Structure 1
Amino acid sequence: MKTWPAPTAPTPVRATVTVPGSKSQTNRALVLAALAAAQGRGASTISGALRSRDTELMLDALQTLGLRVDGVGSELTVSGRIEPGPGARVDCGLAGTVLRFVPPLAALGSVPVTFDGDQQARGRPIAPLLDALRELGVAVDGTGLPFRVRGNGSLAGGTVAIDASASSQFVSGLLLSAASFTDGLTVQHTGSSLPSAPHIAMTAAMLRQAGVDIDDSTPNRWQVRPGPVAARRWDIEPDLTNAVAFLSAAVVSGGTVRITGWPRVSVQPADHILAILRQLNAVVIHADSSLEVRGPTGYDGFDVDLRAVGELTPSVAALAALASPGSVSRLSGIAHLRGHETDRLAALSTEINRLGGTCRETPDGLVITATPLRPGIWRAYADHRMAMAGAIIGLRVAGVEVDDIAATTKTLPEFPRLWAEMVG
């Protein structure tokens, strides 16, 4: 496929960007609306929902189980119930959320539902979640993708001892549907300990918004009581993860980018995000119906802990590679990344060193020494964030091309255009 030329910013970037809806929130909302429907509480709507390959998959996975999902723009309507036909087969595709949030759903089904995916999907961790479903009543065929959920009519619940070291999504998947389990659920996470805490906290927060009663007062443990999941109107925030790619442009150019409609009240870790930016001496600014970041004139190496916002590593690794020459940055708390279908630690190291950079894995993550970069082909590995990280570097390095910018379609179909409008 042809490459994408990453446009340069030889002068400070000035711009106002609208980023599409949160992928995390959208999919939680679809699963909850699905549940509400199946319980028989009527249709739900999702306003400003993200329309992307990842949400399309959840959409699809959801229609396969029996629900009806309509809406062609940002406004989805969810109705129906869980009635898969004989031989149903959910394609998880590239959506790790489909892989982990939808199998519990099917447990609430009567017929067996197969779960399948591509090569990449298949190298995704999913076992502790499969065993957990077994522990809690569900009959499950397979130890990996593809597997079969043998739904009978309901799910017991009870308490499981699952190690969600491998993915918070194991916990969130269980939590979202546990309201409709028989004995509800009590998830216990073992040892230490939850990387991606905000991801589980976004789920807890949305559950409560749906009127579910969840108890998360003692760390590493969640108690969800059986009860109704409410049909309602979900308002989706702009994806703050994707917004950071855009803000990075202001950071590396000493410029200014405004993100419209930045939520003052978030289910997203906006706090963590702005703090990271202030670490670079970026100037944050709450503007008129926007979030405004003014990049510094330059910046040296930083030590940043990313354990709670692991998804930010590629954009942040890029920022580090573009620090003042000689600067040493250490990206910590992301040991747990080293083991996702897409090892971004190794990915990032590989791609940055191929440009003449210096990026070495450390036991806790990465150390990046800022060294002069050279033209080259930034490989995204079909990883939307790897794609956007290459885009950021290309702002300060001429001749950088991303092999597959269309990997951004996973969470941000219009990235190329939005980036093109921002830079120019």
Structure 2
Amino acid sequence: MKTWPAPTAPTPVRATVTVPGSKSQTNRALVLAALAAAQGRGASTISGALRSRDTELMLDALQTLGLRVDGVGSELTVSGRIEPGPGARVDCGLAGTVLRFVPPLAALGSVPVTFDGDQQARGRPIAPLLDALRELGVAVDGTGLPFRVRGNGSLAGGTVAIDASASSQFVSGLLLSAASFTDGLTVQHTGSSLPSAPHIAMTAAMLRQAGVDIDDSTPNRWQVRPGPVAARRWDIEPDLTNAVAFLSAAVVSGGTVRITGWPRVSVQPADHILAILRQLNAVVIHADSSLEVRGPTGYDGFDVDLRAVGELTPSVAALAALASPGSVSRLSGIAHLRGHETDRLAALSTEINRLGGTCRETPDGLVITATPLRPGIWRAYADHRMAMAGAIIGLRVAGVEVDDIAATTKTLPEFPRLWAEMVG
């Protein structure tokens, strides 16, 4: 494969960028639309849906379950029934959301569904969710990929305790399908260190939009009452996490980047994002239905807690590597990143240090000392966000090339074109 040379920014980046839809929101809306259709409520349309590998894997997974998903652009319509064919096999790719959200849904059918994924997915956490499904009476063969859920046409539900410290998606996946369980579900996360609170909250918010009653008033416990899932039209927001990659260009170059269609009230962790950019002394404003970020003339080291927003880690680590020389930054709260698309702590450390940097992995994150970088080959590890972090680095370091820019298809297939258009 040819490398992708990361363009440099010898002068401030100035651009207006449109990012496509949220992966997290698109994939929840697909699941909820599938539940509504399966319950007999008719077809649902998702407007502004992301089209990426993760959402294609999700729509394919729904079609493997017997549903129909129409649309060649950003407008997707879901209709039909859960009626999987003999030996139905869901391909999970490297999509955690398919791996974690689809097994519950499948446990609603009367036909066994097998789940497989990419080689690299087989390393990611899954066993605690499979055990929770067994406790709820679903027959599940296997403790990792490939595994088979042997649905018999209903799932009883009730109460279950789970260790979700490795992934919030274990909670979200149970919550999405719970309204269709005979007695609903009460899920209790046991212990501590539950990452990605905003994504669990996203799940709860979208459930409420579909008319599901969920009680999230006590931390680490959720109660979903049995009931209908409404067929509705979904309006998907831009993906704010991917927007950060583009906004980071403003930050490192002292430029100005605007993101179109930025929501003033969001189901995504907008407030956490904007606060982090402001830590670096970027100026952030809402104007003309867009978000504008003006980078500072320079920035020093920062300490940032990423427990709630761990998917920002690659971009944030790139920012830390590009702080003023000798700056020390500490990224914390992110032990769970060892279980992501790749072990992102290990991968970021390797790649930064290969460029001459100083990144030390810690028990819960990274300590990054900004030092002069040099040319090299930034490896993506089949991880969209590793690829985009190398692009950020390359704005400020000539001769950086990403091995596999196409890893960005996971959530942002047009990244190369959008990035080129931004840098001009």
Counterpart CA distance in 1 for 2:156 and 2:162 is 16
- Deviations, residues 320-370 of structure 1 (Å, cap 9, x unaligned): 000001100011111222233511000000000000000001122110000
| Aligned equivalent of 1:34 | 34
8 A Cα contact 2:35 2:177, kept in partner: yes
8 A Cα contact 1:178 1:185, kept in partner: yes
Offset of 1:193 from its aligned partner? 2.7
Counterpart CA distance in 1 for 2:352 and 2:306 is 19
- Deviations, residues 288-309 of structure 1 (Å, cap 9, x unaligned): 1210000000000001110000
Counterpart CA distance in 2 for 1:339 and 1:23 is 19
8 A Cα contact 2:94 2:341, kept in partner: no
8 A Cα contact 1:136 1:156, kept in partner: yes
Mean CA deviation greater in 276-285 or 112-121: 112-121
- Deviations, residues 171-205 of structure 1 (Å, cap 9, x unaligned): 00000000000111000001103210001000000
Secondary structure in 2 aligned to 1:395?
A: helix
8 A Cα contact 2:123 2:339, kept in partner: no
- Deviations, residues 113-165 of structure 1 (Å, cap 9, x unaligned): 11111211111211010011110111111111001110101000010011111
Counterpart CA distance in 1 for 2:180 and 2:82 is 12
TM-score (norm 2): 0.99
| Aligned equivalent of 2:153 | 153
Offset of 1:66 from its aligned partner? 0.7
Counterpart CA distance in 2 for 1:316 and 1:122 is 27
Counterpart CA distance in 2 for 1:297 and 1:103 is 49
Counterpart CA distance in 2 for 1:123 and 1:335 is 15
8 A Cα contact 1:315 1:385, kept in partner: yes
| Aligned equivalent of 1:264 | 264
Offset of 1:23 from its aligned partner? 0.2
Mean CA deviation greater in 28-37 or 87-96: 87-96
Offset of 1:15 from its aligned partner? 0.3
8 A Cα contact 1:7 1:394, kept in partner: yes
Counterpart CA distance in 1 for 2:57 and 2:220 is 30
Offset of 1:212 from its aligned partner? 0.2
| Aligned equivalent of 2:13 | 13
- Deviations, residues 73-132 of structure 1 (Å, cap 9, x unaligned): 000000001000111100111111100000001100011111111211111211010011
8 A Cα contact 2:260 2:291, kept in partner: yes
- Deviations, residues 21-73 of structure 1 (Å, cap 9, x unaligned): 00000000000000000000000000000000110000000000010000000
Offset of 1:166 from its aligned partner? 1.1
Secondary structure in 2 aligned to 1:97?
A: helix
Mean CA deviation greater in 7-16 or 122-131: 122-131
Secondary structure in 1 aligned to 2:68?
A: strand
Offset of 1:396 from its aligned partner? 0.2
8 A Cα contact 2:342 2:382, kept in partner: no
Mean CA deviation greater in 166-175 or 120-129: 120-129
Identity %: 100
8 A Cα contact 1:359 1:369, kept in partner: yes
Mean CA deviation greater in 137-146 or 291-300: 137-146
8 A Cα contact 1:214 1:224, kept in partner: yes
8 A Cα contact 2:337 2:343, kept in partner: yes
Secondary structure in 2 aligned to 1:83?
A: coil
8 A Cα contact 2:5 2:400, kept in partner: yes
Counterpart CA distance in 2 for 1:282 and 1:396 is 17
- Deviations, residues 380-408 of structure 1 (Å, cap 9, x unaligned): 00100000000000000000000000000
Counterpart CA distance in 2 for 1:341 and 1:208 is 29
TM-score (norm 1): 0.99
Moved over 3 A (4+): none
Counterpart CA distance in 2 for 1:22 and 1:225 is 27
Secondary structure in 2 aligned to 1:353?
A: helix
Counterpart CA distance in 1 for 2:125 and 2:194 is 16
Q: 1:341 to 1:274 in 2, by over 3 A?
A: closer
Offset of 1:287 from its aligned partner? 1.4
Mean CA deviation greater in 137-146 or 350-359: 137-146
Secondary structure in 1 aligned to 2:181?
A: coil
* Residue ranges of structure 2 left out of the alignment (5+ in a row): none
8 A Cα contact 2:341 2:382, kept in partner: no
Counterpart CA distance in 1 for 2:392 and 2:340 is 23
Counterpart CA distance in 2 for 1:353 and 1:193 is 29
8 A Cα contact 2:306 2:331, kept in partner: yes
Secondary structure in 2 aligned to 1:331?
A: strand
- Deviations, residues 224-243 of structure 1 (Å, cap 9, x unaligned): 00000000000000000000
- The alignment yields a C-alpha RMSD, in angstroms, of 0.6
Secondary structure in 1 aligned to 2:323?
A: coil
8 A Cα contact 2:341 2:383, kept in partner: no
Does 2:92 match 1:92? yes
Counterpart CA distance in 2 for 1:383 and 1:87 is 30
Counterpart CA distance in 1 for 2:373 and 2:193 is 37
| Aligned equivalent of 2:190 | 190
8 A Cα contact 1:331 1:367, kept in partner: yes
5 Å-filtered alignment, 1:11-410, equals 11-340=11-340, 342-410=342-410
8 A Cα contact 1:125 1:341, kept in partner: no
8 A Cα contact 1:193 1:220, kept in partner: no
